[PDB]
Ligand binder design. Structure first.
Ligand code: Y82
Ligand code: Y82
Ligand code: Y82
Lengths: 395, 395, 395, 395, 395
């Protein structure tokens, strides 16, 4: 024969090739497909829908017993490229699919002179994963991707690994960083699946373990809270009888309610329930309500409503004791009868204002004591909250 | 003949096979397709659009009378794989479709040596369902999926079940949990459908009964309400004549209105109307309006506007009776003529302030009585609201 | 010949069949297609985009003169199924398309022994419609769907109806209810269309008349309005000189503005303009502004600013007349010289407070009169608003 | 020969037809395609993305030199229908594409007996346009659609017009109105395009000029502004020393800020910058700030802080002049020594209150003058704003 | 032979052409593809998803050794058009793909008489890019697009440039401006890629450098801030003892909080953290908190709570020194015994009011000093903020 080019080899491979039959000379021998995957980027994590969208570079190889030739008599050709849609291709899919991703089509494969067939392709995966958000800013997710043949049983198609699992799990080569998620590892494991007894299938499960970067949410959830706490603290400097303390506190409570309502949408709460962030927000709500109740009580105490005399049973241990326990602080007759009324009226006015002064002093002492108690409680809460981050970070 | 491989069997099956003709030797015998379905995950429930999106694993089998062979003379081959697009396939669809889902294509099927043809595929279903949200947090939905042939009548295609309905309905093997919906059951039923008389079709209806998990909405709808109720309760501690009580109440009402407006979007209301949650919110609105009206009335009562003498007809039964019914509490002439004016002015001032004091006492008594009544009403409402959850949960 | 099966009939129909030529023996005879449609569900009505999305079950039939056979010599076969993509199919589309819907493909059709060819398919339609929202909660929409051949003129393809128009228009058999829209009717009409003179086409127009259910918007637009009206009414019980009336009214106005802004997005306003709901909201705005202006005027009137004596020309007809027209309500010299100053100062203080009391009484009378007038106006407006719904509902 | 039907003509046209070669007998003659377009509906105008989405009905014709036949010997057939995918079709596209629209496929074309080939199809176009929003409510947009062959140069494919440009530009026959946009005209123009010297292409540019209907935004941007202006005007009726004027003004400013923030999203601002609507809103902001500053100044002026005597240098020209310039308005000794203190104290109290009264009168005069000035300024601004609309509308 | 037309040339090129084999006569010679790209429009920059969407016009050429002919004997034809799907086409893709864009298909290519094959097509690219937003309004982005063959190694396919890199980088000919992004340059670079040792591929990387236009965000982030600053400045004109200063300040703080919450969504914060805009906003928060604290302190100082005598140790250096350091400002006995009480009461009232006056003067002096200090600090901050823009712009 002549030597036109290598294309006649293709003819010798595809003159009478049937692409609908599994390529084995003995039907009792299963076709083994060796696969591996490299993660490229974590595209999306929908917590409320429990959906994970990722991108991978996937490659696989198997053996075709009808595509073998001698390199001699073909100008020492050892491998070539063949269109994908002209040979048998296994139907390897992922169990966890909930949608069909958009990925480009690769129309060529390699064939070697010993039946070695290799296939490279990129895949966009939209899978269903169970996400635990119990500790939302510092959660670690552990999803799974299970590769298996949808139809063929283990007697026809078996799945192995292209390379060792040790180098598969420690592989971060093309991964895209600074994208709110950090790829920890990808651990492979082989299994034999069977719902109903009579049919058994080969499955290769890749456990993808990833970790969230908390610094994205470290300023959107912390600074407004401490700002509202510090303005609450500075609000106590107003005197209780000024009259605008109650308006200040109710305005602050309204602002905090608006904040929590407008922020709770961005923090998902699914599965077992809300994360501990909701618990801490509820604690802040309780603290604000306690402060408002103390303000209401002291305003009620220092109010002027034609009060009675101050009670001695709550004066000896409230002014004297608290000073040391805590920080310290014929015509004549007509003239006299006329002037007696003026004198009596001025006396009763003076008595009323003296009673008001005593009640004001009692209220001031109580306000100072409650301010000190609230300040100590706030400091203790801040310390016991920051110690958790301190012990978590040093790990 | 020689023995190249099993592929010649495929040739013997596909040399002169026509895929456009229904595979029966006698045209009077219908082709029976036995199907079954396993639910995988509930993807979405759009209440306002009345749309249900689910994922299922579907499989079916039928008999092809032109794909039969003897296992002998073919190296004892009992079954093989054939491309799907080379044989006749029934057109089984779902009546309730409103859109086309994205599902992967399976290019292979099994064929056994007796004409047995089996087909496995995953399906994403976007169907139309009637959703009842009368009891929104605890609703149970009952949707239907009807499998039928779109064209062929019962004289051509008939539908049966692969396995017993008892094991079909009690099947939760691959279902994905912690996704806001719990799969209760899937009940199958066969029916003969016919709009117009002359044409009758076979239908297999699967009733999918699912239940919503209420704990997702148990913290987003309850804690703010009780928080606003408790701050309303603590707001009554302010004296009526302080002046900031009205501002406090109107600010609280504005906050509650903002809350209800910003939350009502997340609670759908369709079909028959709003759920009972709207009724309970309206009840809370009425309670808040009653509290505001009581505050306005008492502020009007205790106001100083140069009032008249206190009425005896509303004093004997308001102070004395309420104490026991409810909880208890030549130059001379010129000098006299001059001083008489001062005495009279001080007398009239004292009379005015005494009248004001009496009115203030009456207002305080009324405020205490209304506070007790409102507290009892709130307690009764809370008890009669929690008893419904108590009786519902223990079931 | 032998009798393998009916499939040879298919061969006899498809041995030398050309699917690119119109199936008529005489080219002067047009091909008549008889069609009909059953609505299934109204999917979406985008008012701002003027788009209607619906789902229909469509079927059609025509005559193929190259697909005729004798039932004898073919085992008395009268009809069979043929793949759709192997025969000629008319290009019937809808003029009003603005997008391509996603509908499943039906790969089979019936053929009878006289050339009768029937085709069933479901269609998702996304069309452009002119929507009138002049009376938004009670609007009735009248859209059109025009079926016609895109290329062939009336000399090639003509369109008729499968069944009588009377049974077409009175057909609600598979329609999905409780979906915010009620299907009133579907009226068909035939027409001959022609933009430019030389080309005339056959068109079949289905007028789809549907009606909106108002109860969906009967609680989202009515209860907050009446709630704000009733709190406005109860706000008048505050005395004009209390000082928090103005703050109450401005807070109520701010809340109403927030409500209208946050609700106007959900009410579309397109085409000719806003519905009458905007007019009624503007009327409510005017009423609230009138109430605020009355409050401002009365507060200005009852204020203490060292006023002059009360005017007699606005006292005789303001207190006396209004009572019946409306509801009723050597050293000596030094001592005298010294005491004269005190007497004069007390006299001028008493005169000032008497003037203030008179002005307060005038303000109270005016406030009562304006309150009665506003209450009557509100009652009249409510009656004349509810009478429209009363006369509309009983129809 | 016999006379089966016209289909043999199709055979005579498609026995040895090659659809991959340009249909010319001489390769030096370009293939001329005559096209035209009718707009159907303006679907979307994304200003921030600078994207225009439209729907058109497009048709074209050219000459195929291998599809000619004699009407005689073919039963006087002059034209017929041929599948689109069996003949050569030019690749005419639009330069401005940024996405692929979804349009139905038309599988048939006409062929006449002289090689005339005509093609009708609907097209959904998603193109990139430069939008100028300098005058946002009354802007006129001028977009372009350029039809050209993507590959073939002017030596192969040339583009002309099916009909005269005069009847093309004055064509509003199927356009959908009441959709926020009015189609003004569609002007065609031919051009020869060439980036790099060696290659020249034929282009047909259609300038689509459209106009926005302002009445859609005439109620969403005007009524709230005039409402806030009129409530600002009525807010001046409060006396300066009442105390709630400042709260009223700050609440109004907060409401206006909320309005502008919640509305500015719906008004896009791209390219050269914000439209004049932002300038007018800034003017309203400046007016409100001026009003607030005047209120703050007058409240500071009329406040009681133990002031000094009123200044004569700012009293002669402030009360007297403004009235005409603007609108007008042994024991004895002890007794005397004792009473002298009371007399002196009452004298100093009277002096203080007289000083306060004088300052209050000065503040009232200044408040009236500033109110008149602000009213005149508001009237002038309203007139000079409405005159622009008056002169624009009458054009 | 005869001369029908040029189409026989196509036959001579496609009689026995195999499109699945790489077109080289010697398999050891790689196929070189020369490519180039012209950017058309920047479609989208998703910062939170780190996604870049662009549109390009791409063209490439290579050599096909089986598509060569002599121009003579073919009527001097030098080049022609061939369908794309009938010849070998290299699989050149982009590494950074995360999705599949929608671009039109071009069904024709040129072939010259020396095997020259050219291919033109438009491409919509959705790629993953690392975006740095450290200086958000003035950021410059530097993305990469890497063209390479997905399967073939450098022994089969090699990539070069169609034209010189100098004219590639300085090419802005069809780019669409006024779209929030300015194209700075496109720099090409060749590289040899290899993850694992044994396989090496050719890559052509285009670095696309673009710049954001800040004027889009120059009015949405600056004018409200300066407006709130100027109203804060004018709020200091209120006297400290007026009573509405605290309400004014808390309302302003609530408005600023609402502004920052409603604006922070439109400013993304990803990767390394928030831009300096957040730092400047935090600085504004600190300034507002300082102003509020000063107001609270001065209101506490000037309040009347039955204070003690003014302290001399904080009066000599607070009134005298500050004036120069800063800007300046038997029966008888009964009658005497009776009148002594009145005299003493008036004396103590006068002493109390004198003490209040002294404290008010001290508070006024402190308020003026703090106002001057705050004004100077605000001016310094404004100058040191505007100097950065001044030095950045002149570059
Ligand atoms: O589809 C079904 C399935 C559906 C409906 C009923 C079923 N019974 N038993 C099974 C099955 C077997 C499970 N799979 C899958 C098919 N391949 C891919 C994943 C599963 C295992 C192998
Ligand atoms: O499409 C139609 C249909 C359309 C338009 C008019 C019609 N009259 N009678 C019918 C029908 C029969 C009902 N189906 C369906 C076709 N298969 C799937 C579901 C239905 C029953 C069998
Ligand atoms: O797909 C893989 C790939 C996947 C899974 C495992 C892998 N090991 N080594 C590689 C690879 C080689 C890298 N590419 C790509 C294939 N072409 C386009 C881009 C890369 C280089 C050449």
């Amino acid at each position: 024969t002549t030597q036109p080019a290598l294309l006649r080899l293709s003819d010798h491979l595809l003159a009478n090739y049937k692409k609908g039959v599994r390529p084995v000379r003995d039907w009792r021998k299963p076709t083994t497909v060796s696969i591996d995957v490299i993660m490229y980027a974590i595209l999306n994590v929908d917590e409320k829908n429990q959906v994970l969208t990722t991108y991978i570079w996937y490659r696989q190889y198997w053996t075709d017993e009808f595509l073998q030739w001698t390199p001699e008599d073909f100008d020492n050709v050892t491998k070539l490229s063949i269109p994908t849609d002209s040979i048998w291709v296994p139907d390897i899919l992922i169990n966890e699919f909930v949608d069909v991703g958009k990925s480009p089509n690769i129309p060529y494969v390699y064939v070697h002179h010993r039946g070695e067939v290799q296939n490279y392709k990129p895949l966009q995966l939209v899978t269903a994963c169970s996400l635990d958000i119990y500790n939302f800013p510092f959660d670690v997710q552990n999803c799974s991707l299970t590769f298996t043949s949808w139809l063929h049983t283990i007697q026809d198609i078996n799945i192995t690994l292209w390379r060792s699992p040790e180098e598969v799990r420690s592989d971060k080569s093309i991964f895209i960083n600074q994208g709110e998620w950090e790829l920890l590892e990808v651990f492979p494991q082989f299994k034999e699946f069977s719902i109903d007894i009579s049919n058994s299938y080969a499955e290769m499960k890749f456990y993808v373990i990833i970790r969230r970067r908390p610094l994205f949410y470290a300023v959107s959830l912390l600074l407004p809270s401490i700002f509202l706490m510090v303005v609450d603290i500075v609000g106590f400097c107003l005197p209780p009888d000024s009259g605008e303390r109650v308006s200040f506190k109710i305005t602050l409570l309204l602002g905090y309610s608006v904040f929590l309502i407008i922020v709770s949408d961005t923090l998902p709460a699914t599965a077992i329930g809300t994360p501990l962030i909701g618990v801490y927000f509820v604690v802040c709500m309780a603290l604000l309500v306690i402060s408002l109740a103390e303000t209401i009580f002291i305003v009620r105490l220092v109010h002027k409503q034609d009060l009675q005399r101050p009670v001695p049973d709550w004066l000896r241990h409230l002014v004297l004791d608290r000073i040391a326990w805590i920080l310290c602080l014929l015509a004549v007759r007509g003239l006299l009868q006329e002037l007696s009324s003026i004198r009596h009226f001025l006396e009763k006015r003076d008595e009323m204002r003296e009673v008001a002064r005593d009640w004001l002093r009692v209220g001031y002492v109580l306000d100072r004591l409650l301010f000190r108690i609230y300040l100590l409680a706030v400091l203790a809460y801040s310390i016991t909250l920051v110690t958790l981050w301190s012990i978590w970070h040093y790990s």
